Amino acid sequence: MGQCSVLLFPGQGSQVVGMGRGLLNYPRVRELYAAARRVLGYDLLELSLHGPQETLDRTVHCQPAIFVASLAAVEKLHHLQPSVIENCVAAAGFSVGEFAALVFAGAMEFAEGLYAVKIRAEAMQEASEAVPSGMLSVLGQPQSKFNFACLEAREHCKSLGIENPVCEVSNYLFPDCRVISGHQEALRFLQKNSSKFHFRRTRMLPVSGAFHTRLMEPAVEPLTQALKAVDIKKPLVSVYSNVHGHRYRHPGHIHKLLAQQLVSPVKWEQTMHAIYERKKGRGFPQTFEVGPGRQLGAILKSCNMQAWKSYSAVDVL
C-alpha cells in the first residue's frame, strides 16, 4: 500500500553529456525541451545529449540543462510510477534544483522557472568573471575547525593584497562535510594547510566561481528582476529551502528567499535532517532523485543510512 515519497532535485555538478537520452520516449518530454529552446534561444537538448562536454559544464548551460532534465525525469517517473508523484509529501532541490522543485510543486510554471534559471545562470557566470574564485569540497570531522580555517585563509589572502577576501562555507553536505568557497588563493591555502585544521580530505570543484557566497552579490539584482516577472504561488507539496532547511511558507516571501539563496550557504544537511524526521510509528518515505546522476543519493546515504534504503534514482541516460 501507499508510501509517501520525497523527490530530490539535483544541482550543478550532476550534469553529464548524454543526459536526456533515457527521457525522450516518455510523454511530454520532447515538448519540455522544445519549450526550453524557445525560452533559451539555443538547442538545449542537443547540447545535453552530445556536448561539447566543457560547454555543457559551463554554469550558463548546466543550470538550465539540469532544470529541464529534472522536470523531464518527473514526467518519466509519473509515467512509470504515477502513485509516487501522487503520494509526494516533500520536495527539495540542491541550489539550481530548488527551481525545478518549485515548478514541480506548482509554485512556478515551467517557462517562468526556466527564464529565472537562465538569468540566474548568466548572472552567476558574469559574477564569476569579476575575480578568480572557486569551490573546495572538504571532509572534516568533529574536531575540524572550519571557522578558524576560513579566517586563516582570509588573513592569508589579505597578506597577498586581496581586498575583503571571501572564504566561507557555501554548502553543508553531510556530517562534518562542507564546501568552502571564495577567492582562489584562500582555497589553495586551505588545501595546503588541510591537516592543520584537522580536515580529513579536500577536493577543488570544477566550477567557475564561488557560488553561494557574497561573491555572487552581482547576480542578486538580475535574478531579483527576473523573479519580478514571475507569479509565485503557494507550493502544493512541502518544498524545503536551501536557505534555512525549512519549508517555504508565505509565497510572497519566496522571491526574496531565492535571491538570498544565491549568496547564502546551501543548508542541505539541515534539509535532509528536517525531511527525514518521522512522526511516531510512521513509515519511511520512498526517496526519488529526479534528474541526472545519483549524487543526492550518495549524500543521503551519508546523512541517513536508513532513509537511503528506500532511495532510487530516475535514470536520465
HEC string of the chain equals CCCCEEEEECCCCCCCCCCCCCCCCCCCHHHHHHHHHHHHCCCHHHHHHHCCHHHHHCHHHHHHHHHHHHHHHHHHHHHHCHHHHHCEEEEEECCCHHHHHHHHCCCCCHHHHHHHHHHHHHHHHHHHHCCCEEEEEEECCCCCCHHHHHHHHHHHHHHCCCCCCCEEEEEEEECCEEEEEEEHHHHHHHHHCHHHHCCCEEEECCCCCCCCCHHHHHHHHHHHHHHHCCCCCCCCCEEECCCCCCECCCHHHHHHHHHHHCCCCEEHHHHHHHHCCCCCCCCCCEEEEECCCCHHHHHHHHHCHHHHCCEEEECCC
Tell me which method was used to determine the 3D structure: X-ray
Instruction: Of 70, 23, 72, give the one whose Cα is nearest residue 289.
Output: 70
Return the axis-axis angle of helices 184-192 and 146-159, rounded to nearest 10°: 120
Instruction: Of 268, 300, 295, 298, give the one whose Cα is nearest residue 284.
Output: 300
Instruction: Output the nine-digit C-alpha cell for 26.
Output: 516518455
Contact residues for 230 (Cβ-Cβ < 8 A; gap 6+): 108, 112, 113, 115, 116, 255
Q: Are 176 and 107 in contact (CB under 8 A)?
A: no
Cα separation, 239 vs 200, in Å, equals 33
Cα separation, 84 vs 183, in Å, equals 43
What is the spatial order of strands in the sheet that 201-204 belongs to? 201-204, 133-139, 177-183, 167-174, 266-267
Active-site pick, 212, 241, 255, 264: 212
- What count of other Cβ atoms lies within 10 Å of the Cβ of residue 198? 16
Please list the residue range(s) of the chain that carry CATH number 3.40.366.10. Answer: 1-130+208-317
Active-site pick, 5, 48, 70, 95: 95
1-130+208-317 CATH, one of 3.40.50.300, 2.120.10.30, 1.10.600.10, 3.40.366.10: 3.40.366.10
131-207 CATH, one of 3.40.1280.10, 3.30.70.250, 2.60.40.10, 3.40.605.10: 3.30.70.250
Q: Is the dihedral of CA 278, 269, 307, 13 positive or negative?
A: positive
Please list the residue range(s) of the chain that carry CATH number 3.30.70.250. Answer: 131-207
Instruction: Output the nine-digit C-alpha cell for 99.
Output: 527551481
Residue 95 appears among annotated catalytic residues: yes
Resolution of this structure in Å = 1.5
Q: CA angle 123-125-127, nearest 5°? A: 70
